[PDB]
Design a protein around this nucleic acid. Structure first.
Ligand code: DUP
Ligand code: MG
Ligand code: NA
Ligand code: NA
Ligand code: NA
Length: 326
DNA sequence: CCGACAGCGCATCAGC
DNA sequence: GCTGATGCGC
DNA sequence: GTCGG
């Protein structure tokens, strides 16, 4: 974290642009710059030096000079003092409450944790659960705990159908010492790109995880994606573990590699890699990698037999999961 | 100078 | 209900 | 806010 001060600043600006200004591209621009700077192996001495990195432009270079000279950014200092901005940024910290809903709650006078707690009947299901576990959801998950959760999920999925294959992706698969949540990619031979010879594949698994009391709440649930809450069990007299966010993504068995590439991230790594793919004349999603006709129409899916094959198509040297934490 | 910015699942909504 | 745009998050 | 055509 040679440039932790600078990256935090850019990150705070990104969150401002997303939650308050509602300018998603400025948000992504700041996140991109913070990312490229975070992996820069030198302690940045100036904005000029930073402007050499891809993603860092004139505006950010100037902010970096101000920050380096004073240790602060007036622009942020003022933002931190604006009541509306502060209210919106706080409210968006509740899962399910986005930029729009946050600004709307303010208009209605709901702008603090206490306000939210006395107005649950005004929150949709997702927001209600986000408020319920407001504190827990901001706690990190130690890898050791992720290892315990993995054992449970994999073992429970096996009990349902020995043919299910569950893989923990996200920051965990990238080797993180702590994760924000758990990401599980699920496959079953009955569900392929050609057919779904069996229904309730995702339902069965969720059902089984709820039965053993691993999954405690549901934020959203569909045929291929589940978003909810889980908790490791605690021993006698032992204090309870915090409730954790968990996402389960069922993907066509024959499209596992594209699926694991996507669910391993990071999100910025995916944005960078997908952007590169385009420049190389391909389009990548969690299911396939396809070429792009002159027109701009995705052609047919290209054969893929490993994560590496995806890298090869776009002429990128393979990068292990551990090196995708952008 | 200026168009584009990765790609998509689920919940919710308005219009018909 | 069906359909498509919108909000939100992964 | 940044970048490539
Ligand atoms: O905008 C997004 C968000 C997520 N993703 C993918 C990549 C990411 O690694 C994966 C899991 O989403 P999380 O939000 O859980 N991120 P990650 O697991 O990498 O980090 P964290 O430790 O915060 O959960 O989903 C995208 O492709 N685009
Ligand atoms: Mg995750
Ligand atoms: Na640059
Ligand atoms: Na939120
Ligand atoms: Na997740």
């Amino acid at each position: 974290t040679l440039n932790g001060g600078i990256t935090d600043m850019l990150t705070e600006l990104a969150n401002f642009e997303k939650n308050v200004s509602q300018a998603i591209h400025k948000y992504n621009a700041y996140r991109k710059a913070a990312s490229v700077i975070a992996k820069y192996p030198h302690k940045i001495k100036s904005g000029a030096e930073a402007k050499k990195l891809p993603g860092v432009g004139t505006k950010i270079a100037e902010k970096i000079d101000e920050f380096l000279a004073t240790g602060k950014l007036r622009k942020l200092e003022k933002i931190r003092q604006d009541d509306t901005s502060s209210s919106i940024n706080f409210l968006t910290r509740v899962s399910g409450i986005g930029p729009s809903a946050a600004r709307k709650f303010v208009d209605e006078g709901i702008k603090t944790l206490e306000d939210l707690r006395k107005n649950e009947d005004k929150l949709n299901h997702h927001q209600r659960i986000g408020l319920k576990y407001f504190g827990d959801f901001e706690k990190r998950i130690p890898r050791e705990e992720m290892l315990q959760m993995q054992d449970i999920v994999l073992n429970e999925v096996k009990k349902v159908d020995s043919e299910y294959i569950a893989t923990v992706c996200g920051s965990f698969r990238r080797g993180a010492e702590s994760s924000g949540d758990m990401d599980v990619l699920l496959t079953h031979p009955s569900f392929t790109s050609e057919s779904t010879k069996q229904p309730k594949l995702l339902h069965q698994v969720v059902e089984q995880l709820q039965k053993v009391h691993f999954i405690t709440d549901t934020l959203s649930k569909g045929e291929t994606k589940f978003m909810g809450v889980c908790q490791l069990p605690s021993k006698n007299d032992e204090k309870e573990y915090p409730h954790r966010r968990i996402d389960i993504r069922l993907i066509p068995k024959d499209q596992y590699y594209c699926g694991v590439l996507y669910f391993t991230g990071s999100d910025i790594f995916n944005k960078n890699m997908r952007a590169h793919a385009l420049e190389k004349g391909f389009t990548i999603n969690e299911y396939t990698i396809r070429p792009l006709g002159v027109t701009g129409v995705a052609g047919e899916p290209l054969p893929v037999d490993s994560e590496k094959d995806i890298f090869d198509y776009i002429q990128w040297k393979y990068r292990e999961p551990k090196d995708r934490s952008e």
